[PDB]
Design a protein around this ligand. Structure first.
Ligand SMILES: CCCCCCN(CO)Cc1c[nH]c2c(N)ncnc12
Ligand SMILES: CCCCCCN(CO)Cc1c[nH]c2c(N)ncnc12
Ligand SMILES: [Zn+2]
Lengths: 242, 238
């Protein structure tokens, strides 16, 4: 909107957490934002703290897996006071219509490798918790709105996360039947989980790097950079609208 | 010789994974506890020997235990963490009710072998996670004075309950683990990342085999109690 007198309108600094798993998922994010970054070490992570328009952005890569990503997200929330968290990186596709480089937002997430079935618990379920973790409706709808306005496809679906790289037809088919998941990665569920426990709105974005079959290693290696960029670009376009 | 040791305000974090693992701890300390909720956990804050003690159960598995430990450290400033609870035995010499402290821990369900990494390993990390040589030495001294046995060994942690011969054998061959549970590794990991001395203490509840579910169910209370008593006696000496 037009602001004739800028002093009449709110200028308070909104704090946003931006997470990737690997350095390569955040390099494109650092560049696209294109501002100066103070680097703050904590809990074995490097937090990149910068100012971008009305917003304090805190950018880090967690390192791979649930423990890493759980710790980092908890640090963003508790040590940097972030009020929103946006995750960007790559994932493996489990569905034919999600192709290499395609984007998706997780409506729900599950830890696919959790197994308490010995006490009759469904796979993915833990007492005092739930199978499916929710994300922010606000941010997910924002996501669909920018996708539609920029004329780019955006799937929304269930993301499965676990502490294994998936690269076989059998594990894929398990994730589809057990969870109706559209993609697979190693941090999503944990990040969304933490945010839900602290009441912090969370959006999980992923660009497809492979198909989670026996070729996945090679496909992941080939498409990491591009898929990372494609996710980072879309995340920035979300932050610009925030 | 107090004057020679640390003189400031001590704060000690005390963790179980399940409520049943901390109920006996709370009871043993006997002091009054302020309940403080944060990030879906309830932290029980009390004073004993003029140290603050912060007790919580994390809920089950890596994500839960990682969050809770990080909250303890970042929100409550705990300077050491002692974990108490139960675990499945992977070795003949560890039988029901027996105590062990973890010398090292491993996350046994981590698998990046598709990129030729050894099982348990993640880039920019390590297969094995260390614990506090001093806290463990304290546990061992206390054990010998109370004339109770205390093994030292590797504890394997993963987000599955282990109840099969096959997985047992994998844990022994791949990591030379002595016991299995679902939180120890993640707790020790966070403490390591933050430079916080950690001791992981477990009392055996089952043999991690096809009978494990039933054994765990029967022996949870007593094994948790045994662990909790021992943790208390460690805190007594801090
Ligand atoms: C040693 C290097 C490892 C690559 C890390 C893969 N990331 C991890 O979060 C995401 C991911 C992309 N494709 C995947 C797949 N098929 N399974 C699991 N995770 C993924
Ligand atoms: C409803 C499910 C309750 C099991 C909770 C398991 N606790 C660690 O959370 C300890 C444990 C004891 N024995 C075990 C075994 N064989 N495998 C994994 N973990 C363990
Ligand atoms: Zn019974």
């Amino acid at each position: 909107h037009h602001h004739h007198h800028e002093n009449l309108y709110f200028q308070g600094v909104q704090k946003i957490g931006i997470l990737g798993a690997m350095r390569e998922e955040i390099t494109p994010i650092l560049e696209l934002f294109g501002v100066d970054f103070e680097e703050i070490p904590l809990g074995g992570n490097v937090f990149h703290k910068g100012v971008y328009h009305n917003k304090e952005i805190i950018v880090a890569y967690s390192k791979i897996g649930k423990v890493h990503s759980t710790l980092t997200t908890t640090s963003m929330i508790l040590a940097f006071g972030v009020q929103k968290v946006l995750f960007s990186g790559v994932a493996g596709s489990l569905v034919k219509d999600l192709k290499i480089n395609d984007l998706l937002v997780a409506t729900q997430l599950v830890q696919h490798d959790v197994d308490l079935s010995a006490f009759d618990h469904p796979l993915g379920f833990i007492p005092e918790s739930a199978i499916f973790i929710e994300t922010s409706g606000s941010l997910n709808a924002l996501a669909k709105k920018i996708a539609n306005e920029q004329h780019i496809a955006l799937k929304e679906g269930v993301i499965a996360s676990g502490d294994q790289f998936v690269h076989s037809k059998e594990r894929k088919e398990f994730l589809v039947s057990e969870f109706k998941a559209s993609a697979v990665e190693m941090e999503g569920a944990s990040v969304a989980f933490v945010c839900q426990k602290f009441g912090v709105p969370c959006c999980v974005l992923r660009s497809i790097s492979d198909n989670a079959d026996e070729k996945a290693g090679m496909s992941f290696d080939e498409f990491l950079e591009k898929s990372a960029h494609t996710s980072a670009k879309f995340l920035k376009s979300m932050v610009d609208e925030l």
